Design a binder for this molecule. Structure first.
Ligand SMILES: O=C(O)c1ccc[n+]([C@@H]2O[C@H](COP(=O)([O-])O)[C@@H](O)[C@H]2O)c1
Ligand SMILES: O=C(O)c1ccc[n+]([C@@H]2O[C@H](COP(=O)([O-])O)[C@@H](O)[C@H]2O)c1
Ligand SMILES: O=C(O)c1ccc[n+]([C@@H]2O[C@H](COP(=O)([O-])O)[C@@H](O)[C@H]2O)c1
Ligand SMILES: O=C(O)c1ccc[n+]([C@@H]2O[C@H](COP(=O)([O-])O)[C@@H](O)[C@H]2O)c1
Ligand SMILES: O=C(O)c1ccc[n+]([C@@H]2O[C@H](COP(=O)([O-])O)[C@@H](O)[C@H]2O)c1
Ligand SMILES: O=C(O)c1ccc[n+]([C@@H]2O[C@H](COP(=O)([O-])O)[C@@H](O)[C@H]2O)c1
Lengths: 273, 273, 273, 273, 273, 273
């Protein structure tokens, strides 16, 4: 398990010195519980919930696969194990769930509001500390694709890196030999004129930072023109509304980091019996 | 440093095999950069930012103390160190910042909308996985107090625990001897009649789950009545609006977990030069 | 699980580069062995031991639960599993069963002199490095009760703390808003006058330090009339003889941390048979 | 370094979610502090403390060395750092100086009552969990000498191991080619007979477990006679009231694990000034 | 920092319970020492070494940067610091400088035969356990270039993968939406026919496995007319003689992972002087 | 256990952010696989593999033992688990079986060309970083024997250490009381003279570093003469073309660290079926 520790840690920060309830409890027995929802939405974080549960000695009788949709008063999980242990895990479970689910839902919404089957939805390294993965996985279980996961994943730069370079074309070449063979080089651009110097130099990918439909199409055009095998990325602010408009800019994928840093939880709770 | 690793981990998940930019860079030099804002709001996470920075070999020339307020186009930090290293830390810094700042702001707002100096604002164990502390600290730098930090912090129960007990009073006594001496026992209650069985039994604290003003006042009353030294907690949903109404229920503190699981980031970015 | 890593490290230290015997052992085989007393005492350590065994792959046949009493020559545990693993888990097993039971035993000898069903006996924060929780556990299996476990569990102030404090009453006031909601505040006082002040400032617990049986009965009495809701504990070089007296002095609880820093091993050993 | 992680852990167990007093302190500041003794004994732990101090950014002004003797009321250490920290570090620093010194002292007693500049006094493997290295280190300062540290250190066969070895001379011969090149073997014997055999098999050290001062003499002789470079160690329940007695029997070392599993805390405390 | 913990563990393993010499060393003192060649080669390991030194408290006086060439009897490093620490960091230091330079050296011997400024030499994923990154680094200081570093760095498919795949072209299509946006896809092909298929399905990189110089020049040519935007690499038991030929065969890069699993130490040693 | 964390790490370095193929796989499923040899040699690593397998929930159907000989095309292991996993685990499993077997093989060569049932062949401390234990283990299977494992194992003084010791007989005598009770000392000598001295001082093992087969004979004699229980080890740049030569000189063991720092991967691969 690559996430075995992640859970390990999440549980400890809440258990600290050790749960207080178990000290008082006299006779521990084996009971059962459900994870009803309280607000319709999608569901992500199954994988984790499963791992955590087996990791704690909690049997997962019934579960609703990820990527699935639900409505309030719906049973999402019939877990069963010792009583004491059940209560310790209660919170850590709901939490990771609600957070994963939430980003998944808020992401779901961005999907339909895209309406397309030839354009990709991407996220960003804009993630909460220590959740680079836990979240991207969530962005996924919504219907979007994930962009790069780290800074070793694919060399991607912007002005900040080139504000001291002469001859771009010649630059992207002295990199190729000083990089990993299977790494693409994506570049950020703020104006039409840039996208050109880009492609020309080699750029495996070209982004579009804060630029209007007609500003992009000129590039989406100049692209279909000479450099065809060079993906294009619409990335600026991309509001939930101005998102559909860009799908039409004839651009491969649009990255809306807001998918992650804008997703609140989703009501859920746990009841014994 | 108790948070030294927290940062340690946050940086790695993004660096993975190792940043790709540094491979290409030819001559590394020492430059400087700022952390301008892009949306007025409060600021939290100074502590971390500081630690991270020294941890990375980045000098923190100028910083704006936590709990402070800011407006767009404002410089929040003049950091200076090697160029390569500056870029690796760029993201991990903004992230933890924006997230801490965000909860701080959304919390700030809940403060003024409370208007009071005798009533406390509390949060909940409703926190994102692996951020139990990173967040509570944020809830703090907003103006609120923190409730319990874990399940070892203070024995607090609800129906779920008592749906199998006879004689509450006698119960809270066989706990005291099987608990840590400095631990209070807070109890959750959903109806007037409960608050009574509570106090009577001993309960060091009594909460109020999803109950209207007049429902609470009856208890806030019966409290000022016989059991005075028994704090009272208003905790249900407490919308940003129906929050002020409860301040008047004559209750010690009100806990609005929404403070954490509802706070999105806050625009910020980093520019060289 | 929380004590996995504890046990894990307790083993790692003894094996080092690896056991040498398993290098020369020709044919490993399943064998049974028992842990046995060689002196009388009260049993502590089950929790830890069972977890060690089931961790290493050794089956546990029979075990005397914690708190139980045992005479010498008594068989305490029966265990089966690979010969090689038994000889590795041997000292690691015994060692903790001894250090653990050693405390618990020396603890009941106090719980005796104490002799009361209204007064609680408490340990302290004076514990051997890395065994805080371990040792605290033991004290429980000794018949007494644990005080706090850390500096986050509850706020406690003594001379060193106050020497830099003006107007205490005003302090414990503008403190509650920066401490976690459930947190109790306790104060060490070396005299009656100090005692009154504390209680008044709004202390939750007052500690009667190195004070004569009398001075306590008085700081006690004063408390049963002006502040009945305050906790009082007596501490300071209390012994097996003088401990009895304090019990009968109207004082909430007594803390003789010696129950730990003055407890030694209880000779035990393991035989194959 | 080496023990940095030990201290790193010893602290994390006491701090937990975080120190409380540091939440309510108003203005931290630099300050001095002294560790005074309240009991006479011998000082151990220097090694550890100095790292604990530097590790937590505290300055060490003055400090006595390991093995130095001290009287009560003696000022042992002069530390100087931020008031807030000095406090978090206090108990830890003391706990470990009391445990370490505690051991060294009791040890120093056995070394005096042993009386002899040619016979070594040894500890064992009976140690408290997670302190193997620490406690050995302690014994060292008390003026005695360490036995092996773990199971990789050197091979020792007690009866348990032997009860399955037909022909020992071979077993030892056909074990050398497996055990690392530089390892000694030690066999536990309970009769002049066993020791006479064990030695021909080629043991490198012979344990004279629970034997009369006469039998021991016998073996010491046979040793000085036919096997000179063998090495003798007398062990078993040995106490002050019999050490000197065994010292004069020819054995090269007397082994008494009571040195650690029977040692206790030497009273100490920290003052500000 | 990323290689701290690497070095940290490389030390921990050699010291075990702790160095024995520092136990018998009477007076420690500051001394200087040099690491020296005893055979010719290309230098690798600086990054790691400097970090080891400055980590242990040893000053570095002079050092031959990485990639540099050196003859025997040449002085490679001058270091000052506590005698005791020098003797501990000794083998740990040498060992990695050797294993590291050993690779790099054996690598340049290939970069030679290769002889080209249009073709890149690449390592593989066949590395010694725990040294993936370490060894990959070395290969760089050998004059070549690294292939991918993990199974997250980029998707690669070989026989074993395809045996359970129907209609590949359709696969690489409904895959891009589940792979991270930047991810390149590469395919191992054991023949011309396989090669075409790959390219067509939309592969980003095709690997020419155990194929004759010719069959490559052909899978090459075909590619310089129908798919000019595809990467081609040749692999499979390539050696120091036959490696030259492939260079001149219109193929993007060559991957002879032997540059690692077939590289040994380069005799070096350290002298005090 | 012991090495679980080694494997846990070896995997985490290759997986990184996560395996890609597992993102695009459609329906995972159980499957078998064989590890076939493509070179003749001797099998090492069994110990590790079986843990890697069980650790990642893969079933081991059949497997050859450590030290068993194998020819090419020989099927060495039959594993059976989820297709997805079998793949993540593939390279690791092979990498470590190739490194381990690689060593054992070269070793097995020296053991044959050594020829002698009474002279031990030893490795050293010259090992690759983080594999000290692993590589020693490997040498073991090759049929040779391990020297000490670290600096805690036993004390060895080379010239460096000695260059400051006036009077060695004393130094060794007044070092015994510090070093653990069961430790051997070994001194490096470069002349019949040094060895004659070192032995009186009381060394327990004497290194005959870089000496003629004649000088070695000389020392071996003096050894058999005046110091019988001393132990001789010949070392230095020794190769197949001179082993048998030294074996017949009286020394108890020949030390050749080339066994590991010169060993390479033995070709192996994994097939599905
Ligand atoms: O390196 C990455 O993971 C990465 C991938 C895609 C986009 N970004 C950055 O994220 C920015 C958009 O953020 P947002 O949430 O306001 O749409 C974009 O224009 C870049 O400056 C960063
Ligand atoms: O144990 C805790 O840390 C804890 C502290 C305060 C409140 N809670 C729970 O959080 C609930 C309120 O959540 P919210 O965000 O909708 O206001 C409350 O009524 C309880 O069921 C939990
Ligand atoms: O910090 C704590 O949890 C704590 C709780 C109770 C007592 N103490 C300290 O421990 C002292 C008594 O030690 P002793 O010899 O009675 O084990 C007492 O008078 C204080 O100075 C410390
Ligand atoms: O494992 C060791 O290093 C070791 C070394 C010497 C002796 N022992 C055992 O410790 C026993 C004596 O216990 P004590 O009360 O002197 O700590 C002895 O007779 C053996 O059964 C164990
Ligand atoms: O997974 C990778 O990164 C990877 C990259 C390039 C090559 N390989 C494998 O390594 C094989 C060649 O090994 P060798 O003897 O040329 O070092 C090749 O034909 C594949 O089966 C594996
Ligand atoms: O540290 C050890 O365990 C150790 C044991 C035996 C020999 N050495 C050193 O290793 C040297 C021989 O190197 P080699 O090529 O046989 O690996 C020898 O003459 C010493 O300087 C080192």
């Amino acid at each position: 398990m690559e996430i075995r520790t992640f859970l390990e840690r999440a549980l400890k920060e809440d258990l600290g010195h050790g749960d207080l309830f178990e000290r008082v409890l006299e006779k521990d027995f084996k009971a059962t519980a459900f994870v009803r929802a309280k607000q319709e939405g999608v569901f992500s974080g199954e994988k984790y919930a499963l791992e955590l549960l087996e990791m704690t000695g909690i049997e997962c009788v019934q579960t609703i696969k990820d990527k699935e949709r639900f409505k309030p008063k719906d049973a999402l999980m019939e877990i069963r194990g010792d009583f004491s242990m059940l209560l310790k895990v209660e919170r850590t479970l709901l939490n990771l769930l609600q957070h994963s689910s939430g980003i998944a839902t808020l992401t779901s919404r961005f999907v339909e509001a895209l309406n397309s089957h030839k354009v990709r939805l991407l996220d960003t390294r804009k993630t909460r500390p220590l959740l680079r993965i836990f979240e991207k996985y969530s962005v996924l279980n919504g219907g979007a694709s994930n962009h790069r996961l780290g800074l070793d994943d694919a060399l991607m730069l912007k002005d900040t890196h080139l504000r001291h370079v002469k001859d771009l074309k010649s630059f992207l070449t002295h990199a190729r030999k000083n990089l990993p063979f299977t790494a693409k080089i994506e570049i950020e651009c703020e104006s039409f004129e840039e996208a050109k110097n880009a492609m020309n130099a080699g750029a495996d990918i070209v982004m579009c930072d804060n630029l209007s439909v007609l500003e992009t199409k000129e590039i989406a055009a100049y692209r279909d023109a000479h450099y065809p095998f060079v993906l294009l990325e619409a990335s600026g602010n991309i509001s939930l509304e101005s998102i559909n408009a860009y799908a039409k800019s004839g651009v491969d994928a649009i990255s809306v980091g807001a998918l992650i840093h804008q997703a609140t939880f989703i009501d859920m709770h746990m009841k014994m019996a």
